[PDB]
């Protein structure tokens, strides 16, 4: 059963969680090719692993910048989790290491680019196109949540398309192993659950709200709560009001009403029956969950590829030297990395 | 239209993560 599968995956996860891999490569073992994106305290690059010729995505984080932004513990969470997980829609760490200046995490490369890019260009996805992606997220969150992990940054920017048109849930910067409630204000304004905004302790139910936002945005082409400034967005999210496009199916609207539910006693994914309330909803009635997990379903969209290491599905970012100081920075802070 | 209001907004590009 699913329960069985998950139990065993947890045994696998806990062993790596309790004894994390460390220092499993070195920078000189990789050829850096192109920046695939940026964040506040680093960048992700396409790299080639020279001894194998494999391409990977290499996340390069500036330790001093991580410290300035108070993201030390969050970054230690990310690496510790990602080295421990294993799931068809995640990119676990193939290698990790650090030097005087930076932290490095090497992951499976997703050549199709961000879902965001394709969503914005095409405008909106059909309900079937949306459901295909949504299904993969439902399973991933089932997996993560069963490991007592909370993900906390679902959005199209953070869903990478692979060569077969399936997705990888990336950007584990805010992911945290927590059994009770937690309090950190983090995520992306459009995707924040009202509990987070209202400075309440919160739990994994915020990931199910975020799912509601994502399915809406995918199917509408814009999110349920938007404005020019965050503060106006926060006002809309808390208010208790959402409007659906007239082209939204009846089933879709009902699912979204149950995901975008301010009342935790009523929010799908948070009830007694957990994720099955989502899996067994009518909007998912055509979804064969095993076929999705097995990646046997035909993707409704598969990206264009010239070949290995092709990056045409990514935007261009300014390239900047990777400089390695002669002095070790922030040694104690990142001792366990 | 809501679409037009979105496209005319300042938040159609990549959205940054927030944290306290
Ligand atoms: N959301 C896209 C962003 C943004 C990002 C996040 C953090 C930093 Cl420090 C820098 C940039 C992360 C995933 N990445 C990516 N691309 C391709 N294959 C991948 N495999 C794992 C991650 C990844 C592309 C870039
Ligand atoms: Cl990432």
Q: What is the dihedral of CA A226, A230, A232, A233, to 10 degrees?
A: 40
Which residues are bridge partners to A49 per DSSP? A30, A54
Ligand 1 atom nearest the C-alpha of A41 is 9
d(CA A35, CA A16): 30
d(CA A263, CA A118): 33
| Secondary structure class of A47 (helix, strand, coil) | strand
Burial A13-42 (b: 16+ CB within 10 A, else e): beebbeebeeeebebeebeeeebbbebebb
- The position carrying tokens 């790596």 is A16
Residue A303 belongs to what H/E stretch? none
User: With an 8 Å Cβ cutoff, are A184 and B12 in contact?
Assistant: no
Tokens of A120: 């914005």
CB A104 within 8 A of CB A29: no
Tokens of A113: 């680019």
Alpha helices in A54-203 (DSSP H): 63-68, 72-82, 115-122, 127-146, 194-197
Question: How buried is A252 (Cβ within 10 angstroms: 0-12 exposed, 13-18 middle, 19+ buried)?
Answer: buried
CB A303 within 8 A of CB A80: no
A230: closest CA of chain B, how far (Å): 10
In the reported structure, the alpha carbon of residue A164 is separated from the centroid of ligand 1 by a whole-number distance in angstroms of 18
Largest CA distance in chain A: 62
B8: closest CA of chain A, how far (Å): 9
Co-location of A10 and A122 in the same domain: yes
CA of A92, nearest ligand number: 1
Q: What's the distance, Cα to Cα, between the start and end of chain B in Å?
A: 34
Co-location of A162 and A311 in the same domain: no
d(CA A29, CA A76): 23
Nearest-by-Cβ selection for B18 from A189, A220, A245 = A189
Question: How buried is A307 (Cβ within 10 angstroms: 0-12 exposed, 13-18 middle, 19+ buried)?
Answer: exposed
Question: How buried is A243 (Cβ within 10 angstroms: 0-12 exposed, 13-18 middle, 19+ buried)?
Answer: exposed
Ligand 1 atom 14 nearest Cα: A44
Tokens of A152: 């906390």
A225 closest CA partner among A212, A286, A249? A212
A192 closest CA partner among A140, A241, A234, A235? A234
- Tell me the Cα Rg of chain B: 11
CB A309 within 8 A of CB A48: yes
d(CA A265, CA A200): 15
Ligand 1 atom 2 nearest Cα: A158
Co-location of A231 and A218 in the same domain: yes
Co-location of A75 and A173 in the same domain: no
Co-location of A248 and A141 in the same domain: yes
Co-location of A182 and A101 in the same domain: no
Q: Are strands A102-108 and A54-62 parallel, antiparallel or unpaired?
A: antiparallel
User: With an 8 Å Cβ cutoff, are B9 and A228 in contact?
Assistant: yes
CB A131 within 8 A of CB A113: no
Q: What's the distance, Cα to Cα, between the start and end of chain A in Å?
A: 35
Whichever domain contains A41, its CATH number is: 3.30.200.20
Burial A218-231 (b: 16+ CB within 10 A, else e): bbbbbbbbbbeebe
CA of A159, nearest ligand number: 1
Looking at residue A302, the DSSP 8-state letter turns out to be: -
Q: Which domain holds residue A214?
A: 1-19+114-304
CB A105 within 8 A of CB A76: no
Distances (CA, A) of A311 to A113, A114, A171, A288: 8, 11, 19, 32
d(CA B10, CA A115): 19
Residue A138, phi then psi, degrees to nearest 5: -60, -45
Co-location of A219 and A269 in the same domain: yes
d(CA B1, CA A23): 53
Co-location of A258 and A223 in the same domain: yes
| Secondary structure class of A20 (helix, strand, coil) | coil
Co-location of A254 and A149 in the same domain: yes
Tell me, yes or no, if A153 is annotated catalytic: yes
User: With an 8 Å Cβ cutoff, are B2 and A174 in contact?
Assistant: no
Residue A219 belongs to what H/E stretch? helix A205-220
Co-location of A190 and A312 in the same domain: no
Other CB atoms within a 10 A radius of the CB of residue A146 amount to 19
Looking at residue A299, the DSSP 8-state letter turns out to be: P
Catalytic residue, from A28, A62, A148, A153: name it: A153
Whichever domain contains A281, its CATH number is: 1.10.510.10
Co-location of A14 and A24 in the same domain: no
Phi/psi region, residue A51 (left: phi>0; alpha: psi -120 to 50; beta: rest), is alpha
Tokens of A323: 């400089």
Residues from chain A contacting residue B3 (CB–CB below 8 Å): 123, 221-222
Co-location of A250 and A277 in the same domain: yes
DSSP of A63-81, one letter per residue? HHHHHHTT-HHHHHHHHHH
d(CA A199, CA A207): 16
Domain count along chain A: 2
d(CA A103, CA A260): 37
């Amino acid at each position: 059963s699913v329960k069985e599968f998950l139990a065993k995956a947890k045994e696998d996860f806990l062993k790596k969680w309790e004894n994390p891999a460390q220092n499993t490569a070195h920078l000189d073992q990789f050829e850096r090719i192109k920046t695939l994106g940026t964040g506040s305290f680093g960048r992700v690059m396409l790299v080639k692993h020279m001894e194998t010729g494999n391409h990977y995505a290499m996340k390069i984080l500036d330790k001093q910048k991580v410290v300035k932004l108070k993201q030390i513990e969050h970054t230690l969470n990310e690496k510790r989790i990602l080295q421990a997980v294993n799931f068809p829609f995640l990119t676990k760490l193939e290698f990790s290491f650090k030097d005087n200046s930076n932290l490095y995490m090497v992951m499976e490369y997703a050549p199709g680019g961000e879902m965001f890019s394709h969503l914005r260009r095409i405008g909106r996805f059909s309900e079937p196109h949306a459901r295909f992606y949504a299904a993969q997220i439902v399973l991933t969150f089932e997996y993560l949540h069963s490991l007592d992990l909370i993900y906390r940054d679902l959005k199209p920017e953070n869903l990478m398309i692979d060569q077969q048109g399936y997705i990888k849930v990336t950007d584990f910067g805010f992911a945290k192993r927590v059994k009770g409630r937690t309090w950190t204000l983090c995520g992306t304004p459009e995707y924040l659950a009202p509990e987070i905004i209202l400075s309440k302790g919160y739990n994994k139910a915020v990931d199910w709200w975020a799912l509601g936002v994502l399915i809406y945005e995918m199917a509408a082409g814009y999110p349920p709560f938007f404005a020019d400034q965050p503060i106006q967005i926060y006002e809309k999210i808390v208010s208790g009001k959402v409007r659906f496009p007239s082209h939204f199916s009846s089933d879709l609207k009902d699912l979204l009403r149950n995901l975008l539910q301010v009342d935790l006693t009523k929010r799908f994914g948070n009830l007694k029956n957990g994720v099955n309330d989502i899996k067994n909803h009518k909007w998912f009635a055509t979804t064969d969950w095993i076929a999705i997990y097995q990646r046997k379903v035909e993707a409704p969209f598969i990206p264009k590829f010239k070949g290995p290491g092709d990056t045409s599905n990514f935007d261009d970012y300014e390239e900047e030297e990777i400089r390695v100081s002669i002095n070790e920075k922030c040694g104690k802070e990142f001792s366990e990395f | 239209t809501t679409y037009a209001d979105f496209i005319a907004s300042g938040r159609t590009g990549r959205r940054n993560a927030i944290h306290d």
